[PDB]
């Protein structure tokens, strides 16, 4: 009822919660070590390459090889950097990334060695916003790495990280609201339980889209990989970083990818419930299979990430922020209002009045957004005048 | 339909189901063109005599000064090519050779050819 | 005042600057206030090094200048040599057709490289790989025809270094068949892509007056709507007999230039189709043996070499043949003294060549007015006042190949 | 209680990250070089130690207005979470209350937008 | 680094082997094309080949992350300072691949403007002929560099190898003195 | 750091939602304050913190310390007088309880927060937003007007490149050997 | 004490030529000269790192790593680095010798008296 379920959470023996934390840590490490190689190979395929396929069998060790190489590489500390913050920034990026994933439901209750415990490190009454807070703290690593490096390109990268926050933070916060509204809680276990009837992706599609866009932004992934923007700022904020400090920045980014995709699964795709083809199968939602389904959904989001990288340029961060404040925020806010009214009407028996509203509202939005797209702006044309430099005649 | 702007996705997805096109070098090296300007090679007549007569025409034509040739006399006690001259020393500085092929066009005996080995 | 503006180097070593181009930007936070341009980080001494080599040998140098447009540089050089010799009217038809075919396939290749590098500069990573798949399709034909992938020395004064291999025509027909489809695959990534258009529409704007003032040519000029192409005005190498449309745009910005390049690829495919249509067997070298390149390359079991027939001719039978081979290979033709400025429509604009001969076997002067060098005068115009990310898009749109810039 | 697992995961992460930085600094070659330690400027010599008279001391941002608006909007949007979670328990009264509040926020937003506040970045 | 202060026994040997394996398998290039050879380097990264296969997809834009420098072009005089700055700004260990005749020895452009080999300004690990070297040749040279990296000593072994190489190098007669059949 | 710590304390005091919102909102707020520090104060400016008002530093230290001591004295021992745990309140949902209070008893204050938001927006727009008159010219605009930025020194001359000196601050050399003022940007202090 | 001069070149004949231009005692008003010869950049760098050298002569034409690159490196990497003299294989290389920051540059072929005078100027 009142999630977190008090009969499941907060009763682990010290060793068992230690082991669950360790397992989550190792799972995130292996997930990142996978995502690296899988992303490179999938990008290769999307570009008709093979990607890494030599280092170790089938190229398995390539991510591990890169990690160990960065470990074995000289630890640079450039002069002209704020040494303390220059060394802290990777830590500030890493710690919150790992912390956020604590309240992610990787499964339902299971009886490990007699102890009935969740396949989830823990859960909080405000878990979703706790993840949001951890991710927000994580951006300080990016910004302070940019600033403390004392070089123009890292400085610009860090400023782009600040702008990135200004773009995605409010959109993400608003996107959470509709899920809270249909769930009646902020715990992730409660949000998954509330999705037994149906996944909120079908119900809260606008919220899902806004959250996913703000997500791709939050992790600094293409087409919003602006803080790095190798094509503009060379290496962005992680210029001036080498070896395990750069490796920590990138591991933090990939763990943020994993955390936000796991949240997306948790609060829009039934969390760990088996998809439809296995929904009818006995015990598909029990034992360890929920872990498989959760990882499958998370990795579909990972695929979406890689696919975005392989098929889109990167916006200018001003364009992205204009997206966030002119499309994402208005759409999320109006969706929150529409969904609230819809639920109030359904609870008041109005019935059709809600359906007429809901369908109409999006229909209106889909128009006015196109208005800001083609039908009213961003699709105009002009001319110009010549100067005194004896210009030719344009046919 | 706004779908055209998304055509790129259709591309990338499609390509991740068509087979990769990479040549499998070095386990399965690709087919270089028959005409490729590979490593110069000094050839022989069927009886084994060296074709090169040491005329230095190949080195003459090299824009990069990447060929060094010293000619020397063929004699009964020691004959390397038919005729009075042969290339006793024949060096190619491959850190100056630009693979242009002018040497080949210069050579009057076909002693110098370009293989496809690279 | 000062205190709010930083001065930064886009520098030589920067992913968007092709490694040897230095944009010194005075930026107010992140708006480009001034864009100084630093050049010569790729200067190679080609214009002087040429002077110590013969004609038909300087070709190997000139193809290295603008390494993305090798056939254009070589055609400009050899057309200059022929104009000096007065042999422009005697070149075989087949050599001219092959020249048009190779220049247009090179235009496709150069624009593919331009689009790839621009797209990866603007984050469109897959643009690089798709453009380079298409480019490799053409580079295989180049390798077959010339034996080299870049810096070909295939186009030579008075003709070509050799005739097409028997399979070449079928390779080019396959190109004409597939390039439309693969180019369409590339276009799906960029043409209508909302992020790509947003990234280049209205960006790097340059007025037709600006283009005239700086001497801009090529896609940058034609994005102003002016249908100025040296292939139609001032025809050369027989373009007069090819039906093709001068591609132009009205946007005057980066996206207009991009679309012009994408459409110029199609126009090149059309011209290549025409070339194959009007490619009749014949000599590829002027019949005047006093100037014709004497070598006849032919393959064998022992690799590419002089054809054994030629060896027999010059070493067993033909004394005058031997003398001509020896002298044209070693000393090379000597061109009558004089000057001539000959221009071609390189993919990046009016690639001009000032050629001066002192009656000798070595060129007295070969100056390349490379279009990229003049186009880089537009960095100030197309970058100042805009965003640095937009300046990257503008510079990419110029498509500067620094080899030609620095020569 | 109920938070000590989060603390264990945070401790694991912090030890991992601090030891990671320590390894970065400790493992692998180390050789002092003034050029290596100088700022990266795409290969060009970085400015004199006194960067310049004035110079990059202060970085203008073109979105200061949107940053200011972000402060207030981000804080003001947190009222929705308790409202969202308590929905179906507060009744139509709270629905109308938050609809009015969100209309007030919308008026603020529309004033900012239509008057070009969101435009300069 | 401490990894090199291990005792010269089996620990140091195995650490050397694993480190060489890893450094050869993750040999990220610097995004530092110069000329023609830069285009061929991009072609090597292109799908017809796949430099990514060898763990080298990441052309590192920042010198800090780059472990390898494919010079891949002609080093003019005005570029030698910049090229050296980029080299010195990579963090060790770092290797340099002189791609092309221009980078390796100046190539055809034996002139004032060209440095005549980056060896003048930076240590060269491997020289690669070609003008430009075709992508298969670039991959060959990179594999030769992989072989060089794997057989790399560390610590006391590194010092012993430096001493042995120095002693051997002092004896080789210079190229100009290797008069063979040259009269 | 202080905001994060206070958020942790709020969580520890049986106030989860308040602490989490603290972390979130103050992450945002301190990010913006950092941006404004970079804008208005400086990127790494090391302020003197030297007393400019005669003896003001000592007076401020004394007044602050005295006020702190007095407030501590006034607080004194309070918890010993009865500390009713919050369990009876958080039961049923900490956020649920906050929603009950905010939208039932404190509804009027919640409504007035909208007035606060609107006033902040109006202040930002009135004092910060700059209307058309001060709008910076567009790149499109700049290229125009007698072909600005290119007719004029087409692209201003690059800073000089010397052996041992290639930085942007280096002025270029004119044929006579003098230093070209145009090569070095206006803002740089010569060299 | 004897002065130690690091002569760097992979060409043995250039090293012998440098050792000939500079006798055991150049400018008899000066101390004796001790020669440590190195033919590899890593060894030259390590010897410099050992220190105690009064001058280093780096053949600008050294094959695997030029003496100009080593000169710039040693000036960037050794605190209190000894003055560097460079042998340049080309007159146009002078500019790079200026960039190498070597106190002097002596063009190839090594002119004995010119090299001796340059060294005496650096070691005085
Ligand atoms: C008996 C038994 C079963 C025992 C099991 C014991 C066992 C194996 C333990 C598991 C738990 C572990 C690992 C504990 C040990 C302690 C520990 C965690 C140490 C960490 C040390 C450390 C900080 C670093 C050393 C390496 C390491 C293993 C670190 C963690 C794993 C990883 C993957 C970290 C960093 C690597 C990483 C994520 C990024 C590297 C940087 C990049 C750019 C990656 C590659 C890459 C990317 C990502 C691109 O974006 C890209 C795009 C386009 C083209 C190419 C690329 C490209 O190359
Ligand atoms: S290879 Fe040919 S051109 Fe060269 S010396 Fe021998 S015979 Fe003469
Ligand atoms: S390929 Fe060209 S550069 Fe190389 S040896 Fe032959 S003629 Fe000389
Ligand atoms: S070596 Fe040849 S292909 Fe490579 S950059 Fe130099 S000229 Fe171009």
Instruction: Please state which architecture CATH assigns to domain E2-177.
Output: 3-Layer(aba) Sandwich (3.40)
Helices A243-268 and A205-218 cross at an angle (nearest 10°) of 180
Structure tokens at D46: 């970085």
Domain CATH for F1: 1.20.120.1200
Q: What angle do CA E124, E128, E134 make, to 5 degrees?
A: 145
Chains with 3+ CB–CB pairs under 8 A to F are A, C, D, E, G
d(CA F129, CA D66): 10
The domain ranges of chain E are 2-177
Decide if E72 contacts E44 (C-beta within 8 A). no
Using DSSP bridges, classify how beta strands E126-128 and E95-99 pair: parallel, antiparallel or unpaired: parallel
Strands G104-107 and G84-88, how do they pair? parallel
- HSE, side-chain direction, 13 A CA sphere, residue C220: 36
The conformation of residue E55, written as its DSSP 8-state character, comes to: T
Q: Per the annotation, does B58 bind a ligand?
A: yes
* Rounded Cα gap, residues A109 and C407, in angstroms: 71
Cα(C111)–Cα(C114) distance, integer angstroms: 5
- Which ligand has the nearest atom to the CA of E55? 1
DSSP state, residue C317:
I
Domain limits at G86? 1-124
CA distance A60 to A317: 35
E47 contacts in chain A (CB < 8 Å): 47-49
Residues 6+ apart with CB under 8 A from B73: B84, B85, B86
CA dihedral C317, C323, C324, C330 (to 10 degrees): 130
d(CA A4, CA A24): 19
- Of all protein residues, the one whose alpha carbon is nearest to atom 6 of ligand 3 is B103
Alpha helices (runs of H) in A205-242, residue ranges in sequence order: 205-218, 230-233
Q: A165 near A137, Cβ under 8 Å?
A: no
Residue with tokens 């795409």: D42
**Residue B64 CA, ligand 3 centroid: distance in Å:** 7
Ligand 4 environment, Cβ below 6 A: B 98; C 64, 67, 151; E 35-37, 73-74, 100-102, 107, 131-132
**Among partner residues C189, C207, C387, which is closest to A316 by beta-carbon distance?**
C387
Could you give the domains of chain B?
Answer: 4-118 (3.30.70.3270)
Helix, strand, coil percent content, chain G, rounded in steps of 5: 40, 20, 40
Which one, of G66, G46, G58, lies nearest residue G118 by Cα?
G58
Q: How far apart are CA A226 and CA A223, in angstroms?
A: 8
Q: Which of A324, A162, A153, C27 is CA-nearest to residue D60?
A: C27
In angstroms, the Cα distances linking D90 to D97, F17, F97, G23 are 10, 18, 11, 101
C149 C-alpha to ligand 2 centroid (Å): 26
Pairing of strands C349-357, C365-369: antiparallel
| Residue (of A211, F37, A325) closest to D72 by Cα position | A325
Q: Pick A232's closest partner by Cβ from C125, C196, C392.
A: C392
- Look at ligand 1, atom 17, and give the residue with the nearest C-alpha: D16
Task: Identify the CA nearest to C86 among candidates C368, C369, C357.
Answer: C357
Q: Which of A215, A166, A210, A169 lies closest to A369 in space, CA to CA?
A: A210
In chain G, the number of structural domains is 1
Interface residue F118 vs chain D (CB under 8 A): yes
Can you list the pairs that A284-292 forms with residues at least 24 positions away whose Cβ atoms lie under 8 Å?
A285/A108, A286/A108, A287/A110, A288/A107, A288/A110, A288/A119, A290/A106, A290/A107, A290/A108, A290/A119, A291/A106, A291/A107, A291/A119
Q: C309 with C325: CB under 8 angstroms?
A: no
The residue written with tokens 């002067």 in the block is C365
**Cis bond upstream, residue A4 (ω within 30):** yes
* CB neighbour burial string for D27-44, b if at least 16 within 10 angstroms, e if fewer: bbbeeebebbbbbbbbbb
Token digits for C366? 């070969």
In three-state secondary structure terms, C262 is helix
Q: B37 and C147: CB-CB below 8 Å?
A: yes
Q: For residue C155, give the nearest of C34, C241, C62 by alpha carbon.
A: C62
Give break positions in chain C: residue before each, C–N beyond 2.5 Å. Answer: none
CB C119 within 8 A of CB C128: yes
C205: tokens are 């704007």
Give the integer Cα–Cα distance in Å for C294 and C292.
6
On whether any CB of chain A is under 8 Å from the CB of E93, the answer is yes
Residue range(s) defining the domain that contains residue F66: 1-132
B-chain CB neighbours of C53 within 8 Å are 63
- The DSSP element (H or E) to which D94 belongs, if any, is helix D92-114
Question: How many other C-beta atoms lie within 10 A of the C-beta of residue C171?
Answer: 19
> How many other C-beta atoms can be found within 10 angstroms of the C-beta atom of residue D58?
19
Choices 1.10.1060.10, 3.40.50.2300, 1.20.58.1610, 2.40.110.20: CATH for D3-115: 1.20.58.1610
Pocket probe mutation, ligand 1, options A63, A67, A93, A246, max atoms within 8 Å of Cβ: A67
Answer whether C384's CB lies under 8 Å from C36's CB: no
B63: exposed, middle or buried (Cβ count in 10 Å: 0-12, 13-18, 19+):
buried
* Separation of CA C184 from chain center: 23
**C-beta separation of A135 from A173 below 8 A:** no
Could you say which of 3.40.50.9100, 3.90.1200.10, 1.10.645.10, 2.130.10.10 is the CATH number of the domain covering C5-406? 1.10.645.10
Strands C155-156 and C6-9 turn out to be: unpaired
| CA atoms of A259 and F176, how far apart (whole Å) | 65
- Which of E31, E43, E63 is opposite residue C136, by nearest beta carbon? E43
CB contact under 8 A, C113 and E39: yes
- Domain ranges in chain D are 3-115
Query: C75 near C104, Cβ under 8 Å?
Result: no
Peptide bond before residue B31 is cis, with ω within 30 degrees of 0: no
Please list, in sequence order, all residues whose beta carbon lies within 8 angstroms of the beta carbon of residue C149, skipping any fewer than 6 positions away.
C139, C142, C143, E40, E43, E132, E134
Q: Is B55 annotated as a binding residue?
A: yes
Which ranges of C215-314 would DSSP assign to H, the alpha helix?
219-222, 254-277, 308-312
The residues pairing with A110 across neighbouring beta strands, listed in sequence order, are A117
Q: Which residue of A lies nearest to D81 if distances are taken between CA atoms? A: A177
In this structure, which residue's CA is closest to atom 21 in ligand 1?
A: D20
- Is-contact A95 A251, C-beta < 8 A? no
- Number of alpha carbons in the 13 Å side-chain half-sphere of residue G40: 16
Residues A212-221 as b/e (b if ≥16 CB within 10 A, e otherwise) read bbbbbbbbbb
d(CA G16, CA G22) in angstroms, rounded, equals: 10
* Token duo for residue A363: 């229909």
Ligand 1: residues whose CB is within 6 Å?
Answer: A 26, 29, 32-33, 36, 40, 63, 66-68, 70-71, 244, 247, 250-251, 254; D 16, 20; E 57-58
């Amino acid at each position: 009822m009142t999630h977190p379920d008090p009969t499941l959470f907060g009763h682990d023996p010290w060793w068992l919660m230690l082991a669950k934390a360790v397992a989550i840590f190792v799972f995130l490490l292996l997930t990142v070590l996978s995502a690296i190689l899988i992303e490179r190979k999938l990008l290769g395929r999307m570009q008709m390459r093979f990607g890494p396929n030599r280092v170790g069998p089938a190229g398995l060790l390539q991510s591990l090889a890169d990690g160990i190489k960065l470990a074995l590489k000289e630890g640079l500390v450039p002069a002209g950097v704020d040494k303390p913050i220059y060394l802290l920034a990777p830590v500030i990026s890493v710690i919150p990334a790992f912390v956020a994933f604590s309240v992610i439901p990787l499964g339902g209750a299971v009886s490990v060695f007699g102890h009935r415990t969740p396949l989830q490190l823990t859960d909080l009454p405000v878990a979703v916003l706790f993840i949001l807070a951890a991710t927000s703290i994580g951006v300080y690593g990016i910004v302070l790495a940019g600033w403390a490096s004392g070089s123009t390109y890292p400085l610009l990268g860090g400023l782009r990280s600040s702008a990135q926050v200004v773009s995605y933070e409010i959109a993400m916060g608003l996107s959470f609201v509709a899920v809270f509204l249909y769930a009646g809680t902020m715990s992730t276990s409660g949000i998954v339980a509330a999705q037994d009837r149906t996944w909120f992706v079908f119900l809260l599609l606008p919220s899902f889209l806004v959250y996913v866009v703000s997500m791709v932004g939050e992790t600094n992934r293409a087409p919003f990989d602006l803080p790095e923007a190798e094509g503009e700022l060379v290496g962005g904020f992680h210029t001036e970083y080498s070896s395990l400090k750069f490796a920590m920045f990138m591991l933090a980014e990939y763990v943020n990818m994993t955390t936000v995709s796991a949240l997306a699964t948790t609060m829009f795709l039934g969390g760990w419930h088996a998809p439809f083809p296995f929904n009818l199968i006995d015990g598909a939602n029990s034992g360890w299979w929920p872990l498989l389904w959760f990882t499958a959904k998370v990795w579909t989001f990972m695929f979406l990430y890689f696919w975005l990288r392989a098929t889109l340029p990167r916006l200018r961060y001003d364009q992205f922020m204009a997206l966030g404040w002119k499309v994402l925020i208005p759409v999320s806010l109006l969706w929150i209002m529409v969904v609230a009214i819809t639920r109030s009407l359904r609870q008041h028996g109005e019935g059709t009045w809600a359906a007429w509203l809901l369908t109409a509202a999006v229909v209106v939005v889909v128009a006015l957004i196109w208005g800001l797209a083609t039908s009213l702006r961003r699709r105009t044309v002009q001319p110009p005048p010549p100067q005194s430099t004896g210009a030719y005649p344009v046919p | 339909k706004f779908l055209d702007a998304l055509a790129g996705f259709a591309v990338t997805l499609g390509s991740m189901f068509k087979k990769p096109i990479t040549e499998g070098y070095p386990e399965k090296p690709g087919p270089v063109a028959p005409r490729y300007h590979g490593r110069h090679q000094l050839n022989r007549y069927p009886d084994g005599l060296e074709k090169c007569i040491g005329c230095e025409l190949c080195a003459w034509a090299c824009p990069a000064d990447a060929i060094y040739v010293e000619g020397a006399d063929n004699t009964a006690d020691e004959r390397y090519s038919p005729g009075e001259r042969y290339g006793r020393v024949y060096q190619i500085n491959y850190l100056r050779c630009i693979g242009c092929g002018l040497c080949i066009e210069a050579c009057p005996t076909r002693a110098l050819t370009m293989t496809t080995e690279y | 005042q000062a205190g709010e503006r930083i001065v930064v180097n886009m520098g030589p070593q920067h992913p968007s600057t092709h490694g040897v181009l230095r944009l010194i930007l005075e930026i107010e936070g992140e708006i480009i206030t001034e864009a100084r341009c630093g050049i010569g980080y790729l200067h190679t001494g080609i214009e002087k090094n040429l002077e110590y080599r013969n004609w038909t040998q300087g070709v190997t140098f000139v193809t290295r200048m603008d390494y993305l447009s090798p056939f254009f540089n070589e055609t400009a050089y050899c057309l200059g040599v022929e104009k000096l010799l007065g042999i422009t009217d005697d070149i075989p038809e087949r050599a001219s057709v092959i020249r048009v075919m190779l220049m247009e396939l090179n235009r496709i290749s150069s624009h593919l490289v331009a689009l790839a590098t621009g797209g990866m500069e603007l984050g469109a990573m897959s643009a690089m790989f798709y453009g380079f798949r298409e480019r490799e399709e053409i580079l295989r034909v180049f390798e077959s025809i010339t034996g080299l992938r870049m810096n070909h020395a295939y186009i030579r004064p008075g003709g070509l270094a050799a005739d097409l291999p028997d399979d070449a025509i079928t390779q080019v027909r396959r190109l004409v068949e597939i390039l439309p489809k693969r180019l369409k695959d590339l276009e799906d990534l960029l043409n209508e892509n909302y992020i790509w258009k947003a990234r280049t529409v209205g960006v790097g704007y340059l007025d037709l007056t600006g283009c005239m003032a700086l001497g801009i040519t090529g896609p940058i000029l034609r994005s102003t709507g002016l249908p100025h192409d040296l292939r139609k005005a001032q025809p050369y190498c027989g373009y007069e007999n090819y039906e093709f449309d001068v591609i132009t745009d009205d946007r005057c910005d980066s996206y207009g230039r991009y679309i012009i390049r994408v459409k110029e690829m199609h126009e090149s495919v059309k011209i290549v189709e025409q070339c194959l249509a009007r490619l009749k067997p014949g000599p590829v070298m002027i019949s005047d043996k006093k100037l014709a390149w004497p070598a006849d390359l032919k393959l064998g079991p022992d690799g590419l070499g002089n054809s054994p027939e030629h060896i027999a001719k010059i070493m067993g039978r033909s004394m005058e043949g031997l003398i001509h081979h020896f002298k044209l290979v070693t000393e090379g033709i000597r061109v009558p003294p004089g000057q001539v400025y000959v221009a071609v429509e390189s993919p990046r604009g009016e690639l001009g060549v000032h050629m001066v001969s002192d009656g000798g076997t070595r060129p007295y002067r070969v100056h390349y007015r490379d279009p990229s060098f003049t186009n880089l005068q537009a960095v100030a115009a197309t970058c100042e006042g805009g965003m640095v990310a937009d300046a990257i898009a503008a510079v990419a749109s110029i498509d500067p190949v620094m080899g030609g810039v620095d020569r | 209680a109920l938070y000590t697992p989060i603390l264990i995961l945070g401790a694991i992460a912090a030890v991992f990250a601090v030891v990671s930085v320590g390894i970065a600094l400790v493992i692998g070659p180390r050789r002092f070089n003034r050029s290596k330690l100088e700022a990266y400027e795409c290969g060009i010599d970085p400015l004199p130690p006194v960067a310049a008279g004035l110079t990059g001391q202060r970085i203008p941002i073109r979105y200061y207005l949107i940053a200011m608006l972000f402060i207030v909007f981000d804080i003001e949007i947190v009222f929705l979470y308790p409202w969202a979670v308590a929905f179906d328990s507060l009744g139509l009264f709270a629905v109308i209350e938050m609809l009015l509040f969100m209309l007030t926020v919308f008026v603020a937003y529309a004033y900012v937008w239509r008057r070009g506040g969101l435009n300069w970045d | 680094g401490l990894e090199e202060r291990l005792p010269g026994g089996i620990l140091l040997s195995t650490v050397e082997t694993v480190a060489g394996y890893v450094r050869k398998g993750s040999l990220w290039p610097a995004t530092f094309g110069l000329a023609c050879c830069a285009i061929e380097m991009m072609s090597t990264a292109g799908p017809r080949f796949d430099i990514a296969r060898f763990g080298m997809e990441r052309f590192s834009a920042t010198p800090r992350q780059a472990d390898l420098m494919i010079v891949a072009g002609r080093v003019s005089q005005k570029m030698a300072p910049v090229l050296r700055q980029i080299y010195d700004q990579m963090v060790e260990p770092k290797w340099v691949l002189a791609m092309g005749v221009c980078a390796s020895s100046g190539g055809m452009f034996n002139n004032y403007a060209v440095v005549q080999g980056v060896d003048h300004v930076v240590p060269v690990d491997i020289y690669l002929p070609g003008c430009p070297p075709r992508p298969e040749m670039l991959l060959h040279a990179i594999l030769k560099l992989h072989d060089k990296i794997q057989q790399m000593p560390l610590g006391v072994n590194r010092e012993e190898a430096i001493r042995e190489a120095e002693q051997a190098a002092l004896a080789v007669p210079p190229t100009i003195e290797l008069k063979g059949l040259l009269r | 750091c202080t905001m994060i710590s206070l958020a942790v304390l709020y969580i520890a005091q049986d106030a989860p939602f308040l602490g989490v919102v603290q972390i979130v909102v103050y992450t945002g707020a301190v990010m913006m304050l950092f941006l404004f520090v970079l804008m208005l104060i400086g990127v790494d400016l090391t302020e003197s913190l030297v007393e400019t008002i005669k003896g003001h530093r000592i007076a401020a230290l004394i007044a602050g310390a005295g006020f702190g001591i007095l407030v501590i004295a006034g607080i004194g021992n309070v918890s010993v007088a009865g500390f009713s745990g919050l369990a009876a309140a958080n039961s049923g949902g900490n956020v649920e309880g906050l929603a009950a209070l905010i939208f039932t008893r404190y509804l009027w204050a919640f409504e007035l927060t909208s007035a606060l938001l609107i006033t902040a927006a109006l202040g930002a727009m009135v004092l910060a937003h700059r209307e058309r008159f001060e709008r910076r010219k567009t790149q499109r605009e700049l290229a125009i007007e007698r072909f600005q930025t290119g007719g004029h020194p087409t692209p201003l001359p690059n800073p000089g490149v010397y052996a041992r000196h290639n930085s942007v601050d280096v002025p270029a050399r004119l044929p006579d050997g003098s230093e070209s003022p145009l090569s070095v940007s206006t803002i740089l202090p010569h060299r | 004490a004897p002065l130690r001069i690091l002569v760097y070149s992979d060409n043995p004949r250039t090293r012998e030529q440098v050792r000939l231009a500079l006798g055991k005692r150049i400018h008899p008003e000066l101390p004796e000269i001790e020669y440590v010869d190195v033919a590899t950049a890593p060894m030259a760098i390590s010897q410099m790192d050992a220190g105690g050298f009064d001058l280093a002569i780096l053949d600008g034409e050294a094959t695997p790593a030029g003496g100009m690159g080593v000169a710039k490196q040693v000036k960037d990497e050794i605190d209190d680095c000894p003055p560097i003299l460079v042998l340049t294989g080309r007159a146009d290389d002078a500019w790079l010798a200026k960039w190498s920051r070597a106190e002097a540059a002596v063009p190839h072929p090594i002119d004995p008296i010119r090299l001796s005078d340059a060294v005496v100027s650096l070691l005085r």
